[PDB]
Design an enzyme around this catalytic site. Structure first.
Site, mmCIF file in Angstrom:
data_model
loop_
_atom_site.group_PDB
_atom_site.id
_atom_site.type_symbol
_atom_site.label_atom_id
_atom_site.label_comp_id
_atom_site.label_asym_id
_atom_site.label_seq_id
_atom_site.Cartn_x
_atom_site.Cartn_y
_atom_site.Cartn_z
ATOM 1 N N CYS A 141 0.833 -1.178 -0.129
ATOM 2 C CA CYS A 141 0.129 0.142 0.017
ATOM 3 C C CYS A 141 0.652 1.349 0.102
ATOM 4 O O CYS A 141 1.618 1.489 0.843
ATOM 5 C CB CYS A 141 -1.043 -0.099 1.179
ATOM 6 S SG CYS A 141 -1.995 1.516 1.169
ATOM 7 N N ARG A 150 0.181 4.587 2.798
ATOM 8 C CA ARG A 150 0.115 4.431 4.337
ATOM 9 C C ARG A 150 0.768 5.565 5.311
ATOM 10 O O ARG A 150 0.404 5.411 6.476
ATOM 11 C CB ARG A 150 1.181 3.428 4.738
ATOM 12 C CG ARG A 150 0.563 1.675 4.569
ATOM 13 C CD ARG A 150 1.490 0.754 4.647
ATOM 14 N NE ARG A 150 2.510 0.721 3.566
ATOM 15 C CZ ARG A 150 3.534 -0.008 3.651
ATOM 16 N NH1 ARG A 150 3.939 -0.649 4.716
ATOM 17 N NH2 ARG A 150 4.424 -0.208 2.335
ATOM 18 N N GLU A 209 -4.820 4.135 -10.445
ATOM 19 C CA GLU A 209 -5.533 2.923 -10.511
ATOM 20 C C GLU A 209 -6.889 3.071 -11.247
ATOM 21 O O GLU A 209 -7.244 1.900 -12.014
ATOM 22 C CB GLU A 209 -6.221 2.800 -8.946
ATOM 23 C CG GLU A 209 -5.229 2.721 -8.002
ATOM 24 C CD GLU A 209 -5.686 2.761 -6.798
ATOM 25 O OE1 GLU A 209 -6.046 1.654 -6.186
ATOM 26 O OE2 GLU A 209 -5.855 3.447 -5.806
ATOM 27 N N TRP A 222 -9.010 6.474 -0.556
ATOM 28 C CA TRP A 222 -9.568 7.260 -1.904
ATOM 29 C C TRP A 222 -8.642 6.743 -2.892
ATOM 30 O O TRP A 222 -7.447 6.203 -2.814
ATOM 31 C CB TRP A 222 -9.371 8.834 -1.623
ATOM 32 C CG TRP A 222 -8.094 9.240 -0.944
ATOM 33 C CD1 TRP A 222 -7.026 9.578 -1.754
ATOM 34 C CD2 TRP A 222 -7.852 9.657 0.400
ATOM 35 N NE1 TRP A 222 -5.873 10.140 -0.785
ATOM 36 C CE2 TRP A 222 -6.670 10.017 0.757
ATOM 37 C CE3 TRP A 222 -8.599 9.464 1.662
ATOM 38 C CZ2 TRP A 222 -6.062 10.633 1.824
ATOM 39 C CZ3 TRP A 222 -8.324 9.780 2.755
ATOM 40 C CH2 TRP A 222 -6.850 10.304 2.811
#
Ligand code: HEM
Ligand code: HEM
Ligand SMILES: Cc1cc(N)nc(CCc2cc(F)cc(CC[C@@H]3CCCN3C)c2)c1
Ligand SMILES: Cc1cc(N)nc(CCc2cc(F)cc(CC[C@@H]3CCCN3C)c2)c1
Ligand SMILES: C[C@H](O)[C@H](O)[C@H]1CNc2nc(N)[nH]c(=O)c2N1
Ligand SMILES: C[C@H](O)[C@H](O)[C@H]1CNc2nc(N)[nH]c(=O)c2N1
Ligand SMILES: [Zn+2]
Lengths: 410, 414
Positions: free
Chosen positions: B112, B115, B289, B284
């Site tokens: 991720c 973070r 992506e 969000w």
């Protein structure tokens, strides 16, 4: 045991058996993966099993495993390590070992070509002048007036460690970089220290933006000597753009021949500390890393300015827009000058095809995803979606220490 | 294994020292002979003897974080948990420990890039839920809170933990909000081709599909091991953004849009050896992506061709880089559309810059930061972001999020 790798776009699954033949470490453990670390972590006694392993796979590649020829070679090698603490490769073994070091290079996307490799045996070299003669022949041969040909030149192997042959240049053709009084850097900022060593050794620098560095050549452990590659042997390409006529006014150029000269070739336990090898460029090597790394030529700001892009916020993606145009220009320029170059779409296409070849005929293909995926437009290339297993097969190319950290001068 | 491992950034020369890897718990999949770092995924339930040390390890870690290690409350909590595992073969987390564990599963999520936000996570305790209707109420409240009219807030909702493996709570959806995909008799796909299998399951469960390009799928919700049940999310709770371009007026004519809330709902949350098989969490988006993977993957919406046509690009040679050029413009439109509608989104330059700052802080204050380079580097323009040049160490800390099998593959139908 068997391992499977999947492509998540095509759903093709391949089965890897070849990794059972590796021995060198990767750097990972069962608890820590070091896949993005760039550099993780002889005697008669160590040398024979390594030589025996290599001789075994050579005679197995030419379909004569366990032959009389195989047996006498093992015996020959055995007695040579006894009496001299080393041994010499046959010409055929040298060529086989160099092609397989390329075949085994997990970080190379160009490996579909691995068996078309011209091998130049320079193991009779004894002086820096001899090295320069061998290197010029290589450059002339590999450049071939723009129709580039893969090649490697192999200088004498390491003996006692104090008589190493080394090419001190990291690559045969590179531009100098100069530290400026005001603080900035003329030329290539990655070569500032090597440029200083050449100046400190007597090289007269033109202090320009694209000055080809001299060759600094160490033979048999002696002090290195400077040499100028004759300019007609150095093929360069002015970078222009098919639509933006102002692009030529940026004054950019690059050299056509990528030639790694600082790695170590290992074959059957012998170490070739000088083995310059050359191929042809993938466009992103120049257009993304050389020109747009912040610690390199760092031209994105200029290009985006002439492109009149809004550069006040990152979310306008002005950097990404400028980056594509630069890479269009590089490919267009090499192609217009009939100089061999491959774009990252074609290169990654070919590598997937190569992978399929290797799994079928060899049982696998070691591949380093961190290096194989191009530095731009990653997921619209097929290798982004391809699982890869990384493992270390020998013969191999390895990194070695820079010679200016170990050489005791005259 | 050595006490110190160094990572270098090759653009800036900064060297960081990792000691946190010594707390590594499970396996990466790699060995010292092979690296599996690009492999996507490299009934049983825990017995009492496996549970004791896992709970002690977590409780120890929790009381260290609040600077009460070895205290009276620490030793009493240890003692109360040990009894609970003895009599009931399980134990219940306190609300404080549940919140700490969820935040740290995010903090530990090596794949991720977002973070830096890990300590600002709203945790919704749904362990009192008993039915699929109650799960629907909890999920709706989650979506509305997290969406916040476009000013998105990260959140997780945690349903009851696994007991015997025959009473699992599951969200069968892989994400709370996804568009349907429909296979046509002629082999083409309408909608999102990635969701065709789940879409068919919904239709078999009774969903009437409108058969459009952007139909929000219903929730398929399993409580206490029973058969899952269908629910339609109220459409006013689904914030959507129409995609348009600041320069290309024809871009709106492509009819593209996307939903605002990324909410993963198929992962398993592991805290102190307890297994929360239903734990939807949301953040969000990073622009790529949507702009790169959702729109430009060949097996997704796959619009690069249609965009390149309207851009008047030479599409016969790949070396014209017509794909790369159009990919940039699609990602410009996606960031411009979210920002104009004031829906939180982060570009890949800003997100990777924040992640480097976060990783440096974690190395400084925590002794390390597990990270998966293969996932952290964005899918476009990789090397012009600062994470491309950053060496990273990947290892598994607990509490953690884990993959689990798809529920339709394991469910015993009543
Ligand atoms: C023929 C055309 C070739 C192409 C298009 C090609 C492409 C590439 C590229 C793009 C890289 C990544 C380099 C970087 O990012 O710095 C690479 C790495 C590498 N290539 Fe190839 N290559 C070619 C030929 C060769 C040859 C002839 C050899 C050796 C005989 C070779 C051995 C290697 C090795 C060892 C690496 C890894 C270097 C390192 O770890 O620093 N390549 N190649
Ligand atoms: C708040 C803003 C956030 C941003 C910008 C962000 C960004 C990302 C991105 C870009 C990915 C890669 C996703 C993919 O390629 O499919 C990812 C993965 C992940 N994120 Fe974050 N994320 C955020 C919040 C969260 C939260 C709140 C959690 C959990 C509490 C979380 C846990 C994870 C996990 C576990 C993964 C790995 C998913 C997998 O392996 O499939 N993220 N995140
Ligand atoms: C045979 C070959 C073909 C090809 N197509 N390309 C290469 C690499 C080309 C290259 C040219 C240079 F002039 C300088 C460097 C050094 C790059 C360094 C090494 C590690 C970090 N950095 C990327 C590589 C080699
Ligand atoms: C909290 C959060 C924030 C953020 N910004 N992003 C994510 C991932 C979002 C996401 C949305 C989807 F609609 C689908 C998926 C799964 C995609 C699958 C998983 C593995 C391969 N593929 C990428 C993730 C989560
Ligand atoms: C084969 C490879 O592991 C796979 O394509 C990965 C690569 N990196 C990724 N990175 C992110 N963020 N998301 C992904 O889905 C993937 N896919
Ligand atoms: C930290 C990371 O390993 C380093 O930046 C690598 C990443 N991938 C790369 N890939 C290629 N082809 N060349 C590189 O120099 C790098 N650099
Ligand atoms: Zn690994």
């Amino acid at each position: 045991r068997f391992l499977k790798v999947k492509n998540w776009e095509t759903e093709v699954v391949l089965t890897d058996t070849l990794h059972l033949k590796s021995t060198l470490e990767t750097g990972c453990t069962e608890y820590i993966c070091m896949g993005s670390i760039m550099h993780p972590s002889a005697t008669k006694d160590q040398l024979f099993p390594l030589a025996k392993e290599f001789i075994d796979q050579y005679y197995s590649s030419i379909k004569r495993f366990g032959s009389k020829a195989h047996m006498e070679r093992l015996e020959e090698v055995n007695k040579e390590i006894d009496t001299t603490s080393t041994y010499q490769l046959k010409d055929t073994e040298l060529i086989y070992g160099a092609k397989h070091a390329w075949r085994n290079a997990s970080r190379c996307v160009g490996r579909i070509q691995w068996s078309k490799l011209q091998v130049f045996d320079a193991r009779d070299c004894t002086t820096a002048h001899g090295m320069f003669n061998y290197i010029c022949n290589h450059v002339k041969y590999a450049t071939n007036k723009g129709n580039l040909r893969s090649a490697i030149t192999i200088f004498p192997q390491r003996t006692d460690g104090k008589h190493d042959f080394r090419v001190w240049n990291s690559q045969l053709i590179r531009y100098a970089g100069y530290k400026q009084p005001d603080g900035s850097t003329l030329g290539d900022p990655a070569n500032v220290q090597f440029t200083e060593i050449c100046i400190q050794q007597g090289w007269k620098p033109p202090r320009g933006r694209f000055d080809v560095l001299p060759l600094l050549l160490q033979a048999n452990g002696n002090d290195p000597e400077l040499f100028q590659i004759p300019p007609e042997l150095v093929l360069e390409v002015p970078i222009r753009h098919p639509k933006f006529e102002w692009f030529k006014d940026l004054g950019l150029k690059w050299y056509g021949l990528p030639a790694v000269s600082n790695m170590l070739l290992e074959i059957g336990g012998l170490e070739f500390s000088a083995c310059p090898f050359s191929g042809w460029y993938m466009g992103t090597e120049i257009g993304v890393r050389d020109y747009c790394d912040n610690s390199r030529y760092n031209i994105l700001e200029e290009v985006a300015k002439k492109m009149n892009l809004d550069m006040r916020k990152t979310s306008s993606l002005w950097k990404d827009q400028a980056l594509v145009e630069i890479n269009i220009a590089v490919l267009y320029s090499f192609q217009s000058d009939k100089v061999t170059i491959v774009d990252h779409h074609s290169a990654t296409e070919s590598f997937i095809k190569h992978m399929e070849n290797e799994y079928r005929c060899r049982g696998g293909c070691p591949a380093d995803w961190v290096w194989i995926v191009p530095p731009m437009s990653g997921s619209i290339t097929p290798v982004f979606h391809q699982e890869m297993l990384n493992y270390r097969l020998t013969p191999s190319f390895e990194y070695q220490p820079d010679p200016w950290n170990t050489h005791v001068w005259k």
